[PDB]
Amino acid sequence: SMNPPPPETSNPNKPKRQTNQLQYLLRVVLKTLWKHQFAWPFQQPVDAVKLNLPDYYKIIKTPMDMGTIKKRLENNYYWNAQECIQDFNTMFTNCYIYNKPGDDIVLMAEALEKLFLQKINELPT
Numbered sequence: 001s002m003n004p005p006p007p008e009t010s011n012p013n014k015p016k017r018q019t020n021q022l023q024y025l026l027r028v029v030l031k032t033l034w035k036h037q038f039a040w041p042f043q044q045p046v047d048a049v050k051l052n053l054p055d056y057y058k059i060i061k062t063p064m065d066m067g068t069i070k071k072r073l074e075n076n077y078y079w080n081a082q083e084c085i086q087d088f089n090t091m092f093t094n095c096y097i098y099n100k101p102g103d104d105i106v107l108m109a110e111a112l113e114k115l116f117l118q119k120i121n122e123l124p125t
C-alpha cells in the first residue's frame with residue numbers, strides 16, 4: 001500500500017509504570033484535545049490514499065496522530081511523559097511542514113497546538 005502500517009501502540013514486555021505526568025497527559029491533555037471541535041483530522045493516522053496525498057509518506061518520516069497517542073497512553077506504552085510530548089510535537093510538525101500555510105488543516109492544528117502548549121505549561125512536576 002501507499003500507507004505504512006500504523007505506529008505500534010502496545011509494548012507487551014515493558015513493565016507497567018504510572019506517573020502523575022502520564023496521568024495528566026491522558027486525563028487532561030489528550031482528553032481536552034480529543035474533544036475539541038478541530039480534533040477530527042488528527043484522531044487517526046493520515047490515509048494518503050483516501051485523502052489523495054500520494055507524496056505524504058515520502059515527506060513525512062515519522063507519522064503521528066492523536067489516535068495513536070491515545071492508545072499508547074491507554075496501553076502504558078510510554079516510559080515517560082516526555083516521549084508522549086514528543087509525539088504531540090511530531091504530529092504538529094508533520095502538519096506544518098507538509099501542508100501550505102493558510103490551509104484549513106494548518107489553522108486547525110495551530111488551534112490544537114495552542115491548547116496543547118497551555119496544558120503542558122501546567123504539567124505536574
Ligand SMILES: Cc1cc(/N=N/c2ccc(C(=O)Nc3ccccc3N)cc2)c2cc[nH]c2c1O
Pocket residue numbers: 040041042046051053094095098099105
Ligand atoms: C493531519 C492531516 C489530516 C488531513 N485530513 N484528515 C481528514 C480526516 C477525516 C476527514 C473526514 O472524516 N471528513 C468528513 C467530514 C464530514 C463528513 C464525512 C467525512 N468523511 C477528512 C480529512 C489532511 C488533509 C490534508 N492534509 C492533512 C493532514 O496533514
